[PDB]
Amino acid sequence: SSFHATTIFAVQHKGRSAMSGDGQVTFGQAVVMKHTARKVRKLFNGKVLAGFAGSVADAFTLFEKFEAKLEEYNGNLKRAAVELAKEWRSDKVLRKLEAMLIVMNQDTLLLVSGTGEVIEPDDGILAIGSGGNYALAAGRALKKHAGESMSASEIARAALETAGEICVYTNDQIILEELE
Amino acid sequence: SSFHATTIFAVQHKGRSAMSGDGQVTFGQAVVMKHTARKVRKLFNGKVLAGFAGSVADAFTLFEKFEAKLEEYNGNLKRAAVELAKEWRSDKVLRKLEAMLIVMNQDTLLLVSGTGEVIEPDDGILAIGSGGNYALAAGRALKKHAGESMSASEIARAALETAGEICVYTNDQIILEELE
Amino acid sequence: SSFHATTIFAVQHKGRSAMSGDGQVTFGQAVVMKHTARKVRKLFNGKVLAGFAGSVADAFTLFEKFEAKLEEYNGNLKRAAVELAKEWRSDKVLRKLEAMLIVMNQDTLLLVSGTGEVIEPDDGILAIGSGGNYALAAGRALKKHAGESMSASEIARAALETAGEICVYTNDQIILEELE
Amino acid sequence: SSFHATTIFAVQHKGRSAMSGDGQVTFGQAVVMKHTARKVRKLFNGKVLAGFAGSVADAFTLFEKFEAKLEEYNGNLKRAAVELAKEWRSDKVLRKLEAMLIVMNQDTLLLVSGTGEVIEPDDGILAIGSGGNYALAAGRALKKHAGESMSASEIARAALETAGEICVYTNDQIILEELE
Amino acid sequence: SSFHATTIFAVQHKGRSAMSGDGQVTFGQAVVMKHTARKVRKLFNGKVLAGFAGSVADAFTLFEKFEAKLEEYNGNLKRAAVELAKEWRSDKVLRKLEAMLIVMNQDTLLLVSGTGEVIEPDDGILAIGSGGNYALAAGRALKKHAGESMSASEIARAALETAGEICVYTNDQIILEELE
Amino acid sequence: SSFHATTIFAVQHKGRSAMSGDGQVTFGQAVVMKHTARKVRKLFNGKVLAGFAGSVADAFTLFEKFEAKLEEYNGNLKRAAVELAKEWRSDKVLRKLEAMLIVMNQDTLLLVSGTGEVIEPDDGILAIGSGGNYALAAGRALKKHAGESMSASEIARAALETAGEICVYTNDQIILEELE
Amino acid sequence: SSFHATTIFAVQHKGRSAMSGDGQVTFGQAVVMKHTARKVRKLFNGKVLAGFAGSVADAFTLFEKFEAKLEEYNGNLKRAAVELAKEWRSDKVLRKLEAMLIVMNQDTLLLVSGTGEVIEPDDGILAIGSGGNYALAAGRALKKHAGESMSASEIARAALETAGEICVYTNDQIILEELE
Amino acid sequence: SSFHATTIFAVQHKGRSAMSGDGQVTFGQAVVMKHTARKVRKLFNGKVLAGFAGSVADAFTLFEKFEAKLEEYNGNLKRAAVELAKEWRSDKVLRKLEAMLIVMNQDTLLLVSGTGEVIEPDDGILAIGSGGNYALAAGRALKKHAGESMSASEIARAALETAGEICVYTNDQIILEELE
Amino acid sequence: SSFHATTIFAVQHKGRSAMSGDGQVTFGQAVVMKHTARKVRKLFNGKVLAGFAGSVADAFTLFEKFEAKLEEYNGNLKRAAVELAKEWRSDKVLRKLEAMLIVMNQDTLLLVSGTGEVIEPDDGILAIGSGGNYALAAGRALKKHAGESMSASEIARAALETAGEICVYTNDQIILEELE
Amino acid sequence: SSFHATTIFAVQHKGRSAMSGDGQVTFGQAVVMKHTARKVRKLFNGKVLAGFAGSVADAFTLFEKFEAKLEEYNGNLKRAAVELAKEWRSDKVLRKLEAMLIVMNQDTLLLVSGTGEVIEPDDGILAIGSGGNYALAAGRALKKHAGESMSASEIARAALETAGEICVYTNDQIILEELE
Amino acid sequence: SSFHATTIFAVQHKGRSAMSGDGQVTFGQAVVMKHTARKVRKLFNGKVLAGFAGSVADAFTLFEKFEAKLEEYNGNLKRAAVELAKEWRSDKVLRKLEAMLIVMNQDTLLLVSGTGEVIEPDDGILAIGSGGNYALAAGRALKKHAGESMSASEIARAALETAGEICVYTNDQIILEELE
């Protein structure tokens, strides 16, 4: 009866920062409208990666508000994040949104929700959307037991692939974006 | 207890753009009020096809808003679409609408929802309403295995016919509209 | 726990236009407050028949708004109908109303709902209210297999009688109104 | 979990007009807070009887509005009634009220609801509240088979008594009011 | 989704014993299959009246069992009743039955249920089925305020008539049976 | 999630006895597996017509049991019917069946249910299944206002056609059987 | 939809043992079939008082089983009680019974349930049925603040009266039984 | 999942007016945050006692509004009460409040609710909150069978104690306040 | 919380008989345990194709029972089918099974269910399982508008592929089996 | 589907005031996003400790409002608390918040909720959040049976540790803050 | 309200076969009874590894039955598996069991369920229990991107560790068993 949230995985590993995401539009219990979609975008002069699951409109709206808040607080992800969280909460139109937002720059990773949450993984990894948990497990596993061997981009790629292979709401049309 | 959404199929094939739709008003689990209905209309100087399932009033309201947004952004389907999506979302009166909207012009196909979704089929086909999935499967099948043989208008016609034959909420009173 | 909608049947047959309706007030699962009621009224200088099931207040309000819209668009049932539908929808107080409205003039029959629906039976018959389906079936049957033998008024009479005999929420206190 | 509606019976018989009502406050499935209550009051210079079941506040508010509407339309019960019905409906605060209102004067009896209903018993009797049906049956029975023997006041008295004896939400603390 | 229980009223008044019952088969929320039905029968050599609402099969089964138990305990209504009650309870196939049974002879009135209830009205009146409450109120009312004027048969007739006029599940096809 | 019951109409008119039925297998809210089906069969040496909606297996089982009971009681529809009803009830495997059974011979029409019901229409018509009410209304209407003009077979034909035209679960693949 | 459990209060005070109970048969949310009923009975040679709420049949069955178990264990209330509890539990027909049983003799008070409970009030008072809590509070209150002034029989009388005055399912037709 | 309403008991007896209340904060099905609480306060120059169960904030708000309304209508409890009831109702923020309010002065006792109820016990006693019924029964019992022996303050004390001993949501930390 | 039924498509086209099926084990809302599975098997000496969705055990049990029934009735698919249906029904262990069975030989196609259904598509195509409807629409479409161009095996292949592409519970690990 | 509230324990013991809290972010029935979190903060010039469970945004908002209210009423925890409670209530955006707030200074402990509650533990201990009850029990236990041996900080530490070991929503990443 | 299933992971990698499992008993939404548990056991002369989540009793029963079936079919995992599946299904006492069973020997891995499922991962990995999906993702990830580097035992260890770190129902008390 509703569209399923895309799966987005974000990891920071060895100075590199990558963020992957699948592209599968699923409306209803099992109907697939399309595949190759793009909710992982670059913001603040390609200085930050932002991923929002589901709703291109809501994605846009949020990207913009964060983009703005980013300038208002001079690229300080932390502040921009908490401020966006405050608005998120009081918007009472977006407050409703179940989907969550991931923002990260060269220094830190952050998870933001409409409930006013702003979480920073002490793990260096974040994932959200249908099948985010699967990706999270895969990512955490690969980073801990094969980090020195694979890069952030590679991990992000693998994490999503693993999720797509297990979750019926995640496919192989992966989109990767990274900050140098 | 409510009226069933009509079935609308839209396909772009070999430079041609057709959009079909059945006409069956079904109120309640199985009552049929009438047949031959028309929710597939031409907008922006017959330059775009817009189909909205169910509610002639809501259909009108939405057609108009998109018509307007279309001019405000100079016939740019993409922008007009996402803007409409934003309003759709915040209208909180239309936001409620379960039905979805399909808009397409000579270049691209788009699906818009009150949840703020704006999806573009990488497949060239979209379908919505009671029995949209059946139409979608038929359309995709015919286009992939008989495209070079049948046109967009012909496919749109067949897709709907197939849906009407399987879905108890879809009939044979098909309405076809196309952009040259 | 609520009042049951009266049953109204409207038919156009052989140049004549008749509209019947029972009169039974049923509050709750089975309590009958009274019988002989009147929700089938003549509007626009006896040039149109309007029937609204349940709520004399809501009936009045709607009759008036259509009466008005009728003049604003110079007796054009079609336009007046769709405009009334638009208001119906946005009233968000009447929007709630489950009952539906039937309007017809010397030329055409129309069904209007608070969800913004405006349906025109390609069959020449419409029916609404508790037991409308029974009336609809009886009407359609009589018109198709005994039309040349019985008039529109006669059919409307029979359709309602048949519904009253089957539906525990429809009685024999029938009210008939017709346009010459 | 809520207060049960008192039982009110109104009857017009042989030029006399009486209206009775029990007085039992029942909060919850079976708790009794008190008995002897009074929701049957005289309005418009003792020229009309009005009974509203449950909520002394809502009772007051409605009595007043009708009192007013009564003057605005010069004691015309019918108009005052339908107007009150229209407000009732649109108040969307009272619209919620499940309880119903009975109004009657020397000439006619009327039932008004928050759903915009205005019913006039062709029987000369109306009853509402917890156990109104029982009262209704008793009243109808006594009037039809013992009318010439007992008066309107007497019937109203008996109808309520019978309801109190059967309904666990109706007691013997009956209140009777009548118009000469 | 199920058949509605017929309405049966039994009254003992001034040495006479009458038992009436309507005849209306209602399947589902409002469908009427037929009218004139007969679930009020004479047993034990026309010495007792037994009425069971709904299911001609279950009616038969129960009439028989009581007929039997009646002989086993030599026409002692009381014992036969309680014994039937015990079986009723343990049958766990009839135990399910929602309908209730009324049995009466020249001396006393009794109500029996599948839950093992055996009630004797200290009032001289019993009623069961869709609309039994209405009949009960009417009967009690007529007997108390017009007893000396109308007989048991007459009351039984009126009580049912009153119930039929109010309950959408009770009609005027009344069946009366009485013991001299 | 389940298969929809076929629609069966049975009518006795002017010494003739006809029984029609559509053939549409609908599994789930709107999926159609096939059409032309046959649940209306002749029993007891073409002396009786039996129609059971849905489940060819259950249909068979029941037809057989009635066939048997028919012989055991020497073609006495009435007894065979009530006996079948008793078994129906206690089978507690068939007791579950929602579908109903219609049996009729040269003299009478009967409706049997797993709840132990055995109804005889004082009207001469019976209908059951998805859309049975529509058929019922149509049949009753045609018989009352066009009986002398059309036969039992013709009516049965029309009643079903009308139901198929309104009910999304009834089609035009009608099957007619009649006793001379 | 079911019969309400009568209210039974049992108290042991100053060497005396009394047990009261109201008599009100309430079927459904508010229908009263009769009053003066008797579920408080003397067992084991007037040596024990047993009260069971609702179902005269179930009452009987249980009284008997306890009577028996009482002899099998030589009037040892305690053992007979626990044994009855064990059967109660495994009967899986009575196990279903919601009503509870109270048994007391010259020495102790006991509460038994179909769930296998056997409670002995360290307070000297027990109450069960619709409105048992009210009686319990009244009893406890009177015994603690007016014991030395009123007897066990008097208290039992008062406790029930108080319950009847508050609970719509408890009346004043009190039945008192006591062991010397 | 929510805080349980404290228990408040108010009684007027022999010219004295006392109001007790327990102090037990229970959040959730069984968690106790604290005990000794105070929702029974003196208003209007210690001339009136007001008790509101649960929410110190809502308690305050309401006490103030009544305090005010009290002055606006010159200490007339009755008017102040009904006016507060009207506001209560329309506040649609407090209207939500499930808790009820008790107000009393030297002359009368009154119960007020957010549904617009204003009840005056013809009994001289009122109780509200978790376990108010228990207190009510105890109070009514003690007043009727030991009034001449114990005072209003003493009864109020006892009523609450009895409630605390039975209700798991009422304790022994009783607070008593009285008007001379 | 349960395993999703595989998707099976069976079609008879131009003397050839093919039956495809995907292989995707999905436990729970979206977990995939494996892919390449095989529930489409050859029976009765490769003379018949049988496909059962979900449960290899139940699949086996049913294949065997039909295999047996096949011999008992000398390869008569029709009889074997209906007999299997009867057992299916009465097994009351398999009767529970939601999944359905498809059986076909050189001459006809058949669908069997635990509810005792035995359907024969007058269309020459059958489909069952998660996404069977999608396959059904695709198959019907391709056979009607490209039959003469593609074979039964080819259609079966396409139908499943189309279903896999739309249904999140259907994959590309297709298994095809056909009778020469 | 939502984030679980962190667990916070606050205790005042022997002139010292400590407040601990775990740090575990759990989204959904069992997903853990991170651990080491901080919702226990120092306010009013390290003169007061404030802990709010869940939502860093809501935490901030509330801390600030209390901080402010604290100055407006000159560090009077009591007043600032009740005032905050009043706003909390009327915010109707925060009013929604299920989480609760704990505030304490050198003199007293206070619990505040969006329902307008302001509780002061007469026990000297407060606890909130997922697993607050476990912490509460542990704290109360240790303080009563080992107070003179362990300090407030130590107890707070232990209480949380105990909760973390039992509650699946509480971990060992404890945060402790105390006022000298 | 019930005990959570332990998490078991089984993997076959590079000729080695390992099976890990956590040990955490969680009763209810969040209560932990203990940790270090053992449901991963060696069977058939340490020739096979069997893991069953939750219920030591059910675990035992199943291990034994498979042990037996293993001998009856001479260590043929495949057959023993399917046979166990058949019994599993028909046990209708174990059939109820939600938990699943994993069995593996030197050659193959198998998953068995009470629904009669017998799945063989074409992937070489299987996982079940609370948090089995997390383990599954981690296992699949590690095996695909770090297989040649870590052994089956090592992977099994990591997969569980990863699951324990994310799932609130999985801990670090891991148990590993392997076949040489």
Largest sheet of chain A, order of strands side by side?
A: 5-6-7-8-9
Assembly classification: part of a larger assembly
Biggest β-sheet strands, sense, barrel of chain A? 5 strands, antiparallel
| Count of DSSP strands of chain A | 11
CATH architecture of chain A: 4-Layer Sandwich
The CATH class of chain A turns out to be Alpha Beta
Kindly give the count of domains of chain A. 1
Gross morphology of chain A: globular
Rg measurement of chain A, Å: 15 Å
**Largest interface, counted with CB-CB under 8 A?**
A-K, 21 and 21 residues
Helix/sheet category of chain A: alpha+beta
Order of helices and strands of chain A: EEEEEEHHEEEEHHE
Q: How far apart are the termini of chain A?
A: 40 Å
Keywords (chains A, B, C, D, E, F, G, H, I, J, K): Cytoplasm, Hydrolase, Metal-binding, Protease, Serine protease, Sodium
Pfam families (chains A, B, C, D, E, F, G, H, I, J, K): Proteasome
Subunit structure (chains A, B, C, D, E, F, G, H, I, J, K): A double ring-shaped homohexamer of ClpQ is capped on each side by a ring-shaped ClpY homohexamer. The assembly of the ClpQ/ClpY complex is dependent on binding of ATP.
EC number (chains A, B, C, D, E, F, G, H, I, J, K): 3.4.21.-
Which labels suit this protein?
part of a larger assembly; 11 chains; about 180 residues; alpha+beta; Glutamine Phosphoribosylpyrophosphate, subunit 1, domain 1; metal ion binding (chains A, B, C, D, E, F, G, H, I, J, K); Proteasome_sua/b (chains A, B, C, D, E, F, G, H, I, J, K); EC 3.4.21.- (chains A, B, C, D, E, F, G, H, I, J, K); threonine-type endopeptidase activity (chains A, B, C, D, E, F, G, H, I, J, K); serine-type peptidase activity (chains A, B, C, D, E, F, G, H, I, J, K)
